[PDB]
Structures are given as structure tokens and as C-alpha cells.
Design an enzyme around this catalytic site. Structure first.
Site, PDB file in Angstrom:
ATOM      1  CB  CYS C  86      33.756  34.855  35.288  1.00 28.23           C
ATOM      2  SG  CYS C  86      32.436  35.107  36.469  1.00 28.23           S
ATOM      3  CG  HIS C 186      34.647  39.254  35.850  1.00 27.25           C
ATOM      4  ND1 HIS C 186      33.717  39.543  34.587  1.00 27.25           N
ATOM      5  CD2 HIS C 186      34.076  37.831  36.112  1.00 27.25           C
ATOM      6  CE1 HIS C 186      32.606  38.411  34.479  1.00 27.25           C
ATOM      7  NE2 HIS C 186      33.149  38.247  35.233  1.00 27.25           N
ATOM      8  CD  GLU C 188      36.180  40.200  30.909  1.00 29.93           C
ATOM      9  OE1 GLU C 188      36.149  39.576  32.190  1.00 29.93           O
ATOM     10  OE2 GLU C 188      35.098  40.024  30.389  1.00 29.93           O
TER      11      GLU C 188
END
Ligand SMILES: Nc1ncnc2c1ncn2[C@@H]1O[C@H](COP(=O)(O)OP(=O)(O)O)[C@@H](O)[C@H]1O
Ligand code: NA
Lengths: 583, 82, 212, 82
Positions: C86, C186, C188
Site C-alpha cells: 500500500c 494489502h 498481509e
């Protein structure tokens, strides 16, 4: 301080100085003084720290709600933004990492200004905005309300106090610069970047075990922080204002004290552990020094190097003149007519907020209550509710149904309630001290009925335009214990409307113990004022689901929820099949 | 008929501290080491107006400011021609 | 006994705790690296999300002109895999390791939603656990995610629809060589089914597959 | 030690789309109704500088722009005195 002046002169025995006049005009105000609420607030059942609740004996969740309606009136963006700042710090003072924020907005139209306010601040500190309210009505037009609820997780073996325990201790002030911030001397912009450096700075001081006590610097500033840190300890303090991190060195001693500058924090530690605390601040780009010394004598001494400016007893500052209560006794549950509140889509407002950061959000907002986790443990569920439309017709039953319908939304996910957090948004309390009591007693009785205590609270009074008061709105904030694995996720099923169309308190506990028998059974429940909103259908579409039902028209004050199970629900309450949720 | 080019220079008022411009001021003096005292960071809006006279054009830009572009509370502004 | 990875904690980063966690439960041994630190010993350099330096002038520009840039560039030319998520992508475009730029979303403000993407390219050290064109569900949080093509860059991830109005619906790009990855969504966050999906733990399984 | 006041006008290239600005053009023509076509939005940075002369002072501003303040990819700048 328009009549409370005469009460101050007889306790001092003389006339006040210019340092004392400005000190008690802010300390004995209705914001951080609580004159019309202090006596009612002792009658409400609480949970030795005010703001924390035990969750797993291993962990404990810290939460509070504050009201910033006044600075949001003049300036929307820098008002709501300032709001998230002052509440995030009041949670950090307990040694908790801010893990969730809520925004309870009440306006005439979706003011892009207040929305972008919570956004640019909440997202910049990496605290997920996992939900909030959006009660839009033309009744709030010239008087908007912004109740921000910050929440944080902390270990019980790392918890921080909110008072100075023993003498020989020093109070350290750190964070941003302290300047001239208190349409001229009241507007200030928040620095969300310094707030993040303040969070990671404080949380390293906690794990280093150098924090023995702490308080946030919001309203009143250095005065209302160092005084309330030794007032709950029954001790005193000598404040040296020459050691305060100044932005403009040309400041007069009283302006350094009354400075309501943001991004600042107060920590109580020992003088041998202060050389390691300032090195953590300078590492996190913050400025700080030792300002006050905790003494044994219960007096508050303020000086600027060598010369004095003010000295008054410590307990004369934290305890404001307590006004008398006008106890109110309950009347009959009235017949409520529907007050039209514009049905809006909440997605458009929270898709502007980072509600997934921290990776700890299990249930994203849309379907009421929000569920979180602690990455290992277990989790917590927070909900924010206010029945403002009913509170207009009845200041008691409207506010009482708000506390009960809150507990109804907390059981909908599969969480057993733990605490509540109040926020009183009443009009003028001198023209009608009767309605305030019908509200405070509606929150006292609703906490004895559900057996759910109140952790912390707030009250922002005197909200009027043309002299006409604001609709009495009480904002409740629930907290519940839940297992992040045993949560209701929307599956393709048949929709059932369970409960009855009418309201009767005499058999309310029978709906709660009916929702419980349906949640650990594996069903998805939805408790809402209008059963199903525009918001619910849009959050359902994001999960790739469409809903087609025949919503049984219920009365405004009702006891009904929509259950999405596999087979016909087995409970001791009316169960009608209303539709499906295919694809 | 006719054209009128303008440029608005918006900024936060003298008494209001801007942390955005203060964090960059602290970067250009300590990390980049350039002797720069005392920065402000604002917005610059360019707009073409279709009016009558030079007078009618300037007051058009002024209405578009007090009603939207310039917030009367914390923002200050000064316009120049192009 | 497991590979070495690192997450760069820039003064203001928010998705560092998410990167560490996403790296820990996917076969790596993560370690937080700050400023003035050396990145020689690591095999994967993750440049985290959030608001680095509060996005004060422009996203991560105040972080691109930091000391560990002279250490990321050194690791880039050496050929060690670098992934900027990001906010990290925004740092890599200002460092010059990635082509183009990232401006404000067409739809005025911030977007935090679960967006559908198509992997236009595997045979990339970060996307070889996917088929050529797999429809994956991985989240976002933009206010500056509008990609603008300046050079015929290597397109990796493309949105299904129209989010920021990013040129050719670009979500993720690659370097000339193929060691530096630029990503907007994202990954994660798509590691556990509790938070939402698992389509993103394959982005990490692809890095272990390159390091044989 | 003399001071030289400067003001940097930063704007997106005349062909790089700025929908943040097309959204502003929408409103204050359809919601505030003023004849104002063709409107771009950008940053306005004011900064005072200490140096020997004015030609060596302008050099500091021009440096700060290349390596921080202005993004040479899609932004163009024009500096003036105050
Ligand atoms: N302003 C807001 N910010 C964040 N979340 C919001 C906001 N407004 C509503 N929500 C969320 O949308 C859901 C509430 O939708 P709503 O239409 O009010 O039905 P309900 O009466 O159950 O709250 C909850 O997740 C609530 O937190
Ligand atoms: Na407080």
C-alpha cells in the site's frame, strides 16, 4: 463562572488573581467540572481503575467515549479530527494500544467535513474505525453531535494507574509543542503523525516499566492534568512552568498553564527513571522535560522558575460545586409514533475509514455490532446505540430502550455483555433539570435490570440554538466477551422474524435468553430499529448475497430480530418465516 | 465572451499553526540541511472566468471562495491575475 | 533453519505488525529493522503500509529521502527481492526503483474494501503459486492509489473494476529485472479466514518457491 | 543574514487528469452556479530563506524543489518573490 464566583471568594477568603480567575473559569466549567451530573454519576453502578474491564484474566479491554460537539459546531473537519485525538489519549493513559474507534454522528445531512475528520485522523494513527452511528435528522441541524469512542487492549500485569501514588515522584510532560491554543483562541488543527509517535513512545515506556501513573492533556491542559493526577492520590505538586516545551518562548505564565494544546501526555515516574524516559521521547521526535514534583502536603503550587503565580488547595480544583439532584420516578410506557430519521447507506461513510488495520478485525461494520480479537486469545464486541427518535416523546423510556436495545445487539453476534459507556447530550439543564434526571435514572435502572455496570462516562450540556434545546440523546457503548471462532458469518439461508411486534419490559429478558439459545446454535441474528436497513442490503451484496423478504411491520418500540438459520428456530418466542437469502 | 485567467493562493491564517508545513520545515532544515526559515503549505487554485468587465470577473472568484474553496474560519487567501 | 525477512519501521508506519505476523505464519523469520540499520543479512525486504510521516507533503516522499534508501537501493541492484505494499509502493516510486507515480483516487477520498483482482502475470517471484489469470480476493485501503503509466511497465495485478481509475486498472507492477514489487492491495490481510480470505498467503508461498 | 520571501506554485501537468478538480468544477457551476470553466487544483508552498545574495538564495529553493517539494513526474512549478 457567572454565579460560581461568589462561592469561590468565601473559600479563599479574598479576591482571586488573574492567574486564579482563568484557572477556575476552565476547571469549574461544565466540560471538565461536571456540576449538574456529579451527584447522579455516583448513583450509577460502576465496575480500582475507571475505564478498564477484565476480559480473560490474562488481558483487559480499556474503553471510553467523549463528546466534541462544541468545536465541531464552528469547524467540522478540525473539530471531529480534534475529537479522535483527545479520546485516543484517554485510552493510552491506561497503557493500552488503541485497537478500535467508533463515531456517533448526528447531523442534518452527511457533512463531508465531519466524516473526512475522523477519516484523515483515524487512518493516520492505524486505529481501525470498526463502526459508528449516522442518525440523520433536521432536528440536529444547527447543533451537531460527535461522540467518538476509542478502545484499547492491555495485559493486566502491564496496567497503568491514573494517579500519583507516593511522594518523591516527578511528573513528566512530553509530546508536541505547547503553544497559544487556549473563532480566534479556540481553533486548532490536530497532528495525527505526532499522535502515532506519542502512542509508540508511551507503549515503550510501559514495557520498560517506567510508568507508575498517567493522564491525557485534553481540556484544561497542564492544569487539569497535573492537578487530577494528585487529586485522586490525596497528595500535592509543585509545578515549574519554565520546563514546559514551549513553541513560542514569549508566553506569559498563565498561558502555559491554561494551554489546551493537543498531542501532549502526562507521566508519573521516579527521578532516577526520568533520564531514560526523555531519551525515548527524543527518539520518537517528541519534546519533553520534568515539570512537577509530588509532595506530601495537599496543596497545588505553581511557579515560573523563582517567582510564584498561583497557590490554592488541590481538592478545591478537582471537586466542582455539586448541584442538587431532582430525583425522577418512572411513568407508564407510552404509545410511540414514528419519528422519520433519513434512512442512509453507512457503506459510503465507513468505506472512507480503514476498518481492517491491525489485522485484528473479525467482523467489519455493516451488520451492527463489531467483533475483534487479540491474535491469540479470544476477543471483544463493541456496539454503539442511541434511540434519539423515542427519547423525544419520552425522556425516560426512550433512553431506557436505548440501553436495552444495545444489549440486544451485543448478543446478536454471540457475546455475553461486560460493560456500558454513557454519553449525555442534553439541552439546557437549568431550564429543565427534570429531563436530565429522567435520562440519568433511565441509565441507572437499565444497568440494574441487565446487571451490566458502567465503566466510564461523559456529558456535554448547554446545546441550544435560538434558545430551543436539542433532542435528549444518550449514546450507549457496549462491550462483550466472545470467541472469535464462534462468530456468525452470513451464509445462504432462510430468514425468520423472531420476537413480537409490540414492547413490554415485563418479558424482555425472554428475548435475550432466546437469542442466546440461537447464537451458540450457529445462526446469524440482526437486531435493528427498522429491522433491515439500506446498509444491511448493501453489506449483504458485498458478501455476494441478495435478500427478498416481507418485513412484518412493527411498532417503533419493539422486541424483534431477524434470524438467518438453516431449519426453523427452536425458541420460546414467536417465530415467523419471512423469506430467503439466496446466491 | 470574454476570458479572464486567475490564480488563488490559499493558506492557513497567521495565528493557526500548520503541522503539515512544520514537519516539512523541520525536514528541509535538519535532514536536507538547507537554511530555510519558516514554511507554510497551502493550496493554489487556477481558474478561468467568463464575465463582462475586469470588475465583474474579480467578484466572481470572490464568491467561489467564501462559499467553497476558502474556509472562512482557518483559511486566508489572496488572488492574482495571469 | 528458516529464511530471513525484514519489515522496515518508518516513523509513522501502521501495517508493520501485520507484515511481521503475515511473515511469521508463512515460513519466514521476520525482524523489525529501523533507520541507520543494515539490510545485508536479509533475503526479503518488506516496505510496510500505513501513513509514513503522516503523508505530510506527499505519500512516503519524506520517507524516500531517508538514510535506509541508500541501503534499499544497494539491496535492489544486488538482486534481493523487495515488496512494497500500500504505502510502500508509494515509497518505491519516489525512490525510483519503480516506474510511474501514485496520485489521489478519482472518487475523491479513501477506499477500504475487499477488491477482486486478476493476476495478469505469474513467472514472477511473487506470483508463481497462482494460475495465469486467477480471480483473487485481497483488500485495499487507498487515498492515493491512482497509478499513472509513464513507461511500458510490467503489469502484475489488475483490479476487476475501476476502483481508483488507475491506468489500465493497475494494482501491482514489477521492476526491469524483476526483484522489486509494487503493490496497492494489502496481502498481509488475506492470510487468515477470520479477517476475510486466504487468497493472499499464496503471495508469500511464491517467495519461498523462488528461494528453492 | 538577509531573508528572501518566496512562493512556489505547484500544479499537475496541463494534460494529467485531476478529477479532484473536475469534481470542484461540477459543484460551483451546478450547485453554486458561476460561469467558471477550466479549473486546476494544486499546492502553494511559501518559504523564507537565509543566504548571501538573492541569486544564491533562489538556488536553495530550486534545490528543495527537485529533491523534495515537487514531484518531477507529473508536477510543474513556477516560483515568484514576495
Ligand atoms: N458513521 C459511521 N461510521 C462507521 N460505521 C457506521 C457509521 N454509521 C453506521 N455504521 C455502521 O453500520 C452499522 C449500523 O447500521 P444502521 O443502519 O445504523 O443499523 P443499526 O440500527 O443496527 O445501527 C453498524 O456496523 C454501524 O457501526
Ligand atoms: Na480526560
Amino acid at each position: 463562572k457567572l454565579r460560581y464566583l461568589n462561592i469561590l471568594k468565601e473559600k479563599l477568603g479574598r479576591e482571586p488573581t488573574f492567574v486564579e480567575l482563568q484557572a477556575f473559569s476552565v476547571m469549574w466549567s461544565e466540560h471538565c467540572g461536571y456540576s449538574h451530573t456529579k451527584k447522579y454519576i455516583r448513583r450509577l453502578p460502576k465496575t480500582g481503575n475507571a475505564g478498564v474491564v477484565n476480559l480473560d484474566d490474562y488481558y483487559s479491554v480499556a474503553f471510553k467515549i467523549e463528546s466534541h460537539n462544541h468545536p465541531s459546531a464552528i469547524e467540522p473537519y478540525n473539530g471531529a479530527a480534534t475529537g479522535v485525538g483527545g479520546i485516543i489519549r484517554d485510552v493510552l493513559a491506561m497503557g493500552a494500544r488503541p485497537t478500535a474507534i467508533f463515531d456517533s454522528l448526528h447531523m442534518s445531512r452527511i457533512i463531508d467535513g465531519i466524516i473526512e475528520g475522523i477519516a484523515d485522523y483515524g487512518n493516520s494513527i492505524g486505529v481501525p474505525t470498526v463502526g459508528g452511528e449516522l442518525r440523520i435528522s433536521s432536528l440536529y441541524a444547527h447543533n451537531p453531535l460527535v461522540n467518538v469512542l476509542a478502545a484499547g487492549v492491555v495485559r493486566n500485569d502491564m496496567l497503568v494507574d491514573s494517579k500519583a501514588s507516593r511522594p518523591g515522584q516527578v511528573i513528566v510532560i512530553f509530546g508536541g509543542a505547547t503553544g497559544r491554543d487556549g473563532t480566534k483562541l479556540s481553533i486548532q488543527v490536530g497532528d495525527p503523525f505526532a499522535e502515532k509517535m506519542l502512542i509508540e513512545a508511551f507503549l515503550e515506556m510501559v514495557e520498560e516499566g517506567l510508568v507508575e501513573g498517567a493522564q491525557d492533556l485534553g481540556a484544561g491542559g497542564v492544569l487539569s492534568a497535573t492537578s487530577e493526577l494528585v487529586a485522586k492520590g490525596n497528595l500535592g505538586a509543585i509545578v515549574h512552568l519554565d520546563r514546559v516545551p514551549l513553541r513560542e518562548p514569549d508566553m506569559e505564565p498563565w498561558e502555559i498553564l491554561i494551554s489546551e494544546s493537543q498531542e501532549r501526555m502526562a507521566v508519573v515516574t521516579s527521578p532516577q527513571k526520568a533520564s531514560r524516559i526523555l531519551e525515548i521521547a527524543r527518539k520518537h521526535l517528541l519534546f519533553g522535560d520534568v515539570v512537577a514534583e509530588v509532595i506530601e502536603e495537599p496543596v497545588y503550587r505553581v511557579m515560573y522558575r523563582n517567582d510564584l503565580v498561583m497557590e490554592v488547595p488541590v481538592q478545591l480544583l478537582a471537586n466542582a460545586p455539586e448541584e442538587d439532584i431532582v430525583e425522577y420516578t418512572p411513568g407508564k410506557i407510552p404509545e410511540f409514533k414514528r419519528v422519520e430519521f433519513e434512512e442512509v447507506n453507512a457503506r459510503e461513510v465507513f468505506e472512507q475509514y480503514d476498518h481492517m488495520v491491525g489485522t485484528d478485525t473479525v467482523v467489519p461494520p455493516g451488520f451492527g455490532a463489531a467483533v475483534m480479537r487479540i491474535k491469540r486469545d479470544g476477543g471483544y464486541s463493541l456496539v454503539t446505540h442511541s434511540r434519539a427518535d423515542l427519547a423525544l416523546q419520552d425522556t425516560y423510556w426512550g433512553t431506557l430502550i436505548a440501553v436495552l436495545e444495545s444489549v440486544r445487539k451485543t448478543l446478536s453476534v454471540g457475546a455475553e455483555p461486560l460493560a456500558i459507556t454513557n454519553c449525555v447530550n442534553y439541552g439546557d439543564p437549568d431550564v429543565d433539570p427534570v429531563g436530565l434526571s429522567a435520562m440519568m435514572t433511565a441509565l441507572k435502572n437499565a444497568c440494574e435490570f441487565s446487571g451490566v455496570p458502567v465503566a466510564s462516562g461523559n456529558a456535554s450540556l448547554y446545546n441550544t440554538y435560538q434558545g430551543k434545546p436539542i433532542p435528549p440523546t444518550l449514546v450507549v457503548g457496549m462491550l462483550g466477551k466472545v470467541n472469535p471462532q464462534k462468530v456468525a458469518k452470513p451464509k445462504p439461508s432462510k430468514v425468520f422474524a423472531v420476537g413480537w411486534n409490540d414492547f413490554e419490559l415485563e418479558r424482555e429478558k425472554e428475548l435475550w435468553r432466546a437469542i442466546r439459545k440461537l447464537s451458540e446454535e450457529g445462526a446469524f441474528i440482526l437486531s435493528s430499529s427498522q429491522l433491515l436497513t439500506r446498509t444491511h442490503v448493501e453489506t449483504f451484496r458485498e458478501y455476494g448475497l441478495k435478500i427478498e423478504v416481507k418485513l412484518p411491520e412493527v411498532r417503533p418500540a419493539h422486541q424483534m430480530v431477524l434470524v438467518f438459520s438453516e431449519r426453523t428456530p427452536v425458541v420460546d418466542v414467536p417465530v415467523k418465516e419471512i423469506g430467503t437469502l439466496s446466491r | 465572451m470574454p476570458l479572464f485567467k486567475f490564480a488563488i493562493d490559499v493558506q492557513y491564517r497567521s495565528n493557526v499553526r500548520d503541522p503539515r508545513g512544520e514537519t516539512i520545515e523541520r525536514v528541509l532544515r535538519e535532514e536536507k540541511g538547507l537554511p530555510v526559515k519558516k514554511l507554510r503549505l497551502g493550496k493554489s487554485i487556477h481558474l478561468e472566468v467568463e464575465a463582462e468587465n475586469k470588475e465583474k470577473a474579480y467578484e466572481i472568484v470572490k464568491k467561489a471562495c467564501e462559499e467553497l474553496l476558502v474556509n472562512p474560519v482557518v483559511e486566508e487567501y489572496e488572488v492574482r491575475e495571469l | 533453519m528458516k529464511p530471513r525477512a525484514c519489515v522496515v519501521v518508518y516513523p509513522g508506519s501502521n501495517c508493520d505488525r501485520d507484515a511481521y505476523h503475515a511473515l511469521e505464519i508463512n515460513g519466514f523469520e521476520p525482524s523489525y529493522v529501523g533507520l541507520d540499520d543494515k539490510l545485508d543479512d536479509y533475503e526479503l525486504i518488506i516496505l510496510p503500509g500505513g501513513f509514513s510521516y503522516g503523508d505530510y507533503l506527499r505519500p512516503g516522499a519524506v520517507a524516500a529521502r531517508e538514510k535506509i534508501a541508500f541501503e534499499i537501493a544497494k539491496a535492489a541492484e544486488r538482486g534481493k527481492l523487495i515488496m512494497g505494499i500500500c504505502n510502500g509502493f508509494q515509497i518505491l516510486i519516489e525512490m525510483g526503483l519503480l516506474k510511474g507515480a501514485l496520485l489521489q483516487n478519482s472518487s475523491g477520498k479513501f477506499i477500504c474494501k475487499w477488491v477482486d483482482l486478476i493476476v495478469e502475470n505469474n513467472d514472477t517471484p511473487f506470483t508463481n503459486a497462482f494460475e495465469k489469470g486467477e480471480k483473487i480476493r485481497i483488500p485495499i485501503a487507498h487515498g492515493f492509489g491512482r497509478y499513472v503509466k509513464i513507461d511500458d511497465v510490467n503489469v502484475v495485478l489488475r483490479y476487476v473494476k475501476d476502483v481508483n481509475g488507475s491506468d489500465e486498472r493497475i494494482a501491482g507492477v514489477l521492476n526491469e529485472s524483476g526483484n522489486v514489487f509494487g503493490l496497492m492491495p494489502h496481502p498481509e490481510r488475506a492470510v487468515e479466514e477470520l479477517i476475510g480470505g486466504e487468497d493472499g498467503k499464496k503471495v508469500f508461498q511464491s517467495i519461498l518457491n523462488y528461494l528453492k
